[PDB]
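hey so i finaly got around to running the thing on Bartonella effector protein (Bep) substrate of VirB T4SS from Bartonella rochalimae ATCC BAA-1498. pasting the sequence first so u can double check i didnt mess up the copy paste, my clipboard has been acting weird all day
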Amino acid sequence: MLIPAEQLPPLKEEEVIEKIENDACIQKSLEKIRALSKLIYNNPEILEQDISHINANPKMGRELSERIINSPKSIGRLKGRKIGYIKSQKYKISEQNAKILSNEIFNYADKVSNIRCTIMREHKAKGRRLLQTVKMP
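ok and heres what it spat out for the 3d tokens, dont ask me to read them lol
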């Protein structure tokens, strides 16, 4: 049988991704993440794969933010010299910037989560209108 809500076109994942990537706050946040990544790891794109997964699943952003702060060097070698236990000031600044990066990843994931929810809600609302509307001349 024909369930009215199922006669509505499905929301495509590519459309969700496109909306995320074009969001202005997402883009400013991503620029910060890249600049931090360059400062900390000497590689702007070190988290490029992670960003793609977070865009698809924001929950993984919370987990990544935790792991970065648990041990920044898990991601890769930190910028700045270090010999044995003795750290340069530059190395210590990389460790401090990793905390800022962790925070930015958490905030990025929250933004993604809201965008995804807003998109889904607007799509359902449009479907409902398309279903119930009477188009007058």
